[PDB]
Amino acid sequence: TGLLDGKRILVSGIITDSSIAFHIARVAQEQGAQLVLTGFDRLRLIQRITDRLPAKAPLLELDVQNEEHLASLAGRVTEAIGAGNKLDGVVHSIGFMPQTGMGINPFFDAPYADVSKGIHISAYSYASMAKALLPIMNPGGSIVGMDFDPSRAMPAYNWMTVAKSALESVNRFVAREAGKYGVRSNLVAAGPIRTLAMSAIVGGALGEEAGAQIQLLEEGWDQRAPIGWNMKDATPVAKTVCALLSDWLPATTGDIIYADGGAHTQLL
Amino acid sequence: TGLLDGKRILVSGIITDSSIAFHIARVAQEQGAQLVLTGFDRLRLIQRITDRLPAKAPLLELDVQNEEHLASLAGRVTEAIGAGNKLDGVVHSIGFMPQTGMGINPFFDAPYADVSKGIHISAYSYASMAKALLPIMNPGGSIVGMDFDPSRAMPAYNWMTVAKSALESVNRFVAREAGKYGVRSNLVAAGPIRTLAMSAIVGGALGEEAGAQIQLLEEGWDQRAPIGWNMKDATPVAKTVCALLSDWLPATTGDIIYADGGAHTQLL
Amino acid sequence: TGLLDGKRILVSGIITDSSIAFHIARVAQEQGAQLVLTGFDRLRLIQRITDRLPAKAPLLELDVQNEEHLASLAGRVTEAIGAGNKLDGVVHSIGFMPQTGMGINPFFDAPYADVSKGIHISAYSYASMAKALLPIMNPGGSIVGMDFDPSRAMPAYNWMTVAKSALESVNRFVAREAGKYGVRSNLVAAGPIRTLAMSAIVGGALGEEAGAQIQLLEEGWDQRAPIGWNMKDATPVAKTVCALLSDWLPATTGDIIYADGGAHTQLL
Amino acid sequence: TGLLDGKRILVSGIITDSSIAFHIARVAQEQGAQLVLTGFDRLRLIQRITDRLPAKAPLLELDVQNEEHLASLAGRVTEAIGAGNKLDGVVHSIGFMPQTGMGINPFFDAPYADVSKGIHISAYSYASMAKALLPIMNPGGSIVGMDFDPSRAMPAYNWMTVAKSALESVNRFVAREAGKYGVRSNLVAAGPIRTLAMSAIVGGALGEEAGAQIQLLEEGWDQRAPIGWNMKDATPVAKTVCALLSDWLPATTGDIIYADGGAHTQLL
Ligand SMILES: NC(=O)c1ccc[n+]([C@@H]2O[C@H](COP(=O)([O-])OP(=O)(O)OC[C@H]3O[C@@H](n4cnc5c(N)ncnc54)[C@H](O)[C@@H]3O)[C@@H](O)[C@H]2O)c1
Ligand SMILES: NC(=O)c1ccc[n+]([C@@H]2O[C@H](COP(=O)([O-])OP(=O)(O)OC[C@H]3O[C@@H](n4cnc5c(N)ncnc54)[C@H](O)[C@@H]3O)[C@@H](O)[C@H]2O)c1
């Protein structure tokens, strides 16, 4: 086919070629889809990275803490894909949390401004991002954001866990909004993946103990995952997303798909 | 081209032109997949029904309560798709619970021996069928079974619920077995679909009030469903089965996918 | 004798004679527990309200958005229950979300800065309150907070839902912290209770159709509830909080207990 | 009090003084409650064990695979507690599975008769047990059975996992039945406990590998459990049950309480 053939999808979240958003972006192109991209803080420095990709993309500035960039989103996206033209997808592949809310830093010593910043970026934005892009989105289309399963507590994810719990809650509201448009809204709970927002994360060897709470993460997840799990390889999470963007899951919304190797279904 | 070009796939459970398996076989085929089919005791019935599929495909007896068929089955399947050629997909769309287990019939009056039969056919069969079909499956291959969200109580479903709770659990284990061969196990939790048997209960064959309980229950999927649910269109669900059978969710096994238009994620 | 003979217990959140905390303080007391109480900015209001409790008990200002109260609080609590005497129980019955976050107000139009306030007060406060009160707690002691089942979408609750999703997650971590001191953390997921603010929304202060949405939603707890649910009787819920504060669930922490008459376990 | 004061509760499942049912039985007596007991296969040999207990008990034969013993249950129980006298509780502390369905024995090599036997005993019976005893049970009373969390697959629990998934499904039906009587019905998902149906289980050193998948179980669960977990000590699971029998959780049914040290809420 080109499983995303002719489809016109925006893809947020890139900042290196180890970014998952990069990998969704790649696969979506391998597969048919004229793209539009967003980046946060040097674009300059990103365009170099989005170049590294098969086909090419209008790449627009977007800082999701900016009321001013969101108000315009819809504007700019129509410039760049043409007029009388709407989007068929959207990828929220964005997140962030102060070092304070994460790693060995005690849980109680994060002050709320720090956490607020996390939630806003990792949580709220899925909803701004849908408020801005649904008006220019077609029937039978799709939004996807990237989750990491927060049902259970764990060490190191600390307050990011709490943001991800809020993400899932948001996601199902946004589905209720999106469905007035014929749009689906779903997350992809992914298994762990080698991106430098991880070697931030616990990170940075804030440890030497942290060659460890990363090796043992990769062993952990591979052991539990009935089909095994490769932390060096985003393409299984990226193919799973293109699936949601696809029409082949036309009756799932409000929902969370786990591309984690079925590790979450096993206790050990 | 799209989804299944090349893939050989068993598909259980055809009994009517309206059976969920049938709409699975159809879509499988229109997506370039060559099949073997199974069916249970009304066999030349099944051949008339399966003649209305796009491609012909062979068809084999298979009552999952009988070991001489289970034993014999990889034998017969190999035989109808050619020696040293193996199966990339398998679909159990099978299920049964004596009427004693269901509707208006009091919950406490189902004899264990009716309940043991429904659990045999609806839940244990998924394993016994995996046991037998895994020797002729192929890496990156896919088994998918049919589910109804058993995770909470409801009118009518009664002890089919309890079987579906058993299946969700069998499936995790089956994944734990199937990963040995590079094979995913997964269920698809569908919304209600107006099969024949359901056109009959809506039409009053269980009584002029039994049919109302089922109707308010039934009817509130669409009301809950962010993108609606139409129970007289099985296509979204068959489309969902193909997604699992495809290479496009390779990091999910052990799990359940909700093809219920989103409703299981909303309260009202 | 029964439940709490001997136990010293803080209990947040009294604002009305109908507040869920109040019916908690009452039952705590009738069960032989000596208390300290907190409240927020309508302070001599709180003293008239708390005069109708069986025993007197002291009362302290505590707005959880302010650090000089949080800092100061174990100071003040120690002071009102006597030096080298510590707390066996703690109750957060606190919660707020601007009206922009709720009812008929469109989901996408709540400004992050309203959402960050509701999450501050409803969810982050549970940690910041544990941080401060754990130094003066005692082994086998108990913290319990108030929840509403946020695990799926619904009309009205909107972004309070998203906060409650955050709380369920904070609570797991707080347990992970509190176990350091032989202290359980747990939430109680209540059914709806006709507090004052809710007698007002049922009575139409959000509009002659906003009040209907809430009524069909509200009303179907009792219909779902295997043992009924009466929202103008907060006693079962206060009774439930005491169970947690008691020695009689010592192997449960991190968790949520559903005091909703069973309804969250049934579909219809 | 005697938190179960004056209360009249039947307690099934004893066969040694390491049985959990033994421990619930003890604590319920420590606490006020005239008991009635059931045992399975030498009673003879059990009465010696139920003697070991504080106060004393009518101890009745009950093999839950016997249509004949259930038909009589209600009869015998009224002989033994007097007439114009009903029960206020019931403890399903019973289970069983063929060696075949458990341990290193492959999952696929259990034949269905074996599993049927498991489900019947571990699953169905909660429901026969409520069908027989609700007719002689009072308003505001309670039934409890013992769960071990089956949401995730794991090794060794094999088909017992599947029975426990069916138990939870059953439990919420039985609650729907029980509530016509004012009766609650709930499970207690317990953490692991040293009982000789465990050193059956994997068991019997069917291993030497099995000093191990038991030490590592005890280490596992203690590590994850924010308040720590002692596998040599049933009393925390037993106090949790008496709690359900109590009136202090008067608004929970259909439900599952976890007395596992909050290990299930943590991933690690
Ligand atoms: N790394 C993993 O194993 C993993 C696993 C599961 C889920 N996730 C989630 O998947 C998503 C992708 O993360 P990733 O690991 O590819 O890391 P990444 O660092 O490559 O991506 C993070 C992105 O968020 C962007 N970002 C930060 N603030 C922004 C803002 N204010 N506005 C717009 N974009 C902003 C950054 O520019 C960056 O592109 C995130 O939600 C992450 O939490 C990651
Ligand atoms: N119909 C729905 O709305 C719905 C919703 C969710 C899940 N499901 C599930 O989908 C599956 C199919 O049901 P359907 O809707 O296609 O109804 P159906 O009646 O068309 O399918 C049932 C199949 O089970 C077969 N069967 C019973 N005993 C058998 C045996 N011993 N050996 C082989 N086959 C046997 C029937 O012959 C038929 O082929 C079942 O799992 C059902 O529980 C159906």
Ligand SMILES: NC(=O)c1ccc[n+]([C@@H]2O[C@H](COP(=O)([O-])OP(=O)(O)OC[C@H]3O[C@@H](n4cnc5c(N)ncnc54)[C@H](O)[C@@H]3O)[C@@H](O)[C@H]2O)c1
């Ligand atoms: N009412 C229900 O039907 C219901 C159901 C489930 C959960 N809950 C939860 O129970 C809790 C109590 O609500 P309620 O029903 O008792 O309503 P309420 O209005 O009586 O209680 C809210 C409390 O939060 C306080 N508050 C707000 N901001 C504060 C601050 N900065 N510092 C200290 N206190 C502050 C209020 O003053 C009051 O004391 C909340 O968690 C609520 O979300 C209520």
Ligand SMILES: NC(=O)c1ccc[n+]([C@@H]2O[C@H](COP(=O)([O-])OP(=O)(O)OC[C@H]3O[C@@H](n4cnc5c(N)ncnc54)[C@H](O)[C@@H]3O)[C@@H](O)[C@H]2O)c1
């Ligand atoms: N041992 C544990 O760590 C653990 C943990 C969680 C849950 N559980 C569950 O708690 C419950 C108590 O088990 P336990 O470990 O105390 O083991 P146990 O062997 O002491 O109790 C098992 C009981 O089931 C009874 N039983 C077997 N067949 C019976 C029948 N046909 N009719 C009536 N009774 C019958 C036996 O006589 C025995 O009393 C069971 O459901 C078990 O699965 C046990």
Ligand SMILES: Oc1cc(Cl)ccc1Oc1ccc(Cl)cc1Cl
């Ligand atoms: O959520 C994640 C989960 C995993 Cl296992 C790995 C990376 C993840 O993503 C992040 C974690 C922390 C920050 Cl500050 C930013 C991002 Cl994107």
Ligand SMILES: Oc1cc(Cl)ccc1Oc1ccc(Cl)cc1Cl
């Ligand atoms: O699981 C199901 C759920 C729904 Cl809502 C509708 C039909 C279903 O499927 C069955 C129900 C009862 C029997 Cl006897 C056989 C089957 Cl296939």
Ligand SMILES: Oc1cc(Cl)ccc1Oc1ccc(Cl)cc1Cl
């Ligand atoms: O009718 C139903 C409707 C729903 Cl939504 C769920 C279960 C139902 O019950 C049945 C489904 C199939 C068969 Cl054959 C018999 C019965 Cl009673």
Ligand SMILES: Oc1cc(Cl)ccc1Oc1ccc(Cl)cc1Cl
């Ligand atoms: O969480 C709740 C759930 C329900 Cl059904 C009813 C009341 C609740 O509590 C609140 C809702 C909104 C605000 Cl602003 C403050 C509080 Cl305390």
Ligand SMILES: Oc1cc(Cl)ccc1Oc1ccc(Cl)cc1Cl
């Ligand atoms: O009204 C409600 C009823 C339910 Cl069952 C759940 C949430 C509701 O919404 C509210 C609860 C409290 C406040 Cl102050 C405002 C609103 Cl809109």
Ligand SMILES: Oc1cc(Cl)ccc1Oc1ccc(Cl)cc1Cl
């Ligand atoms: O369910 C259990 C879980 C654990 Cl960790 C320990 C014991 C358990 O209980 C049983 C396990 C197997 C058999 Cl054959 C009988 C029983 Cl009572």
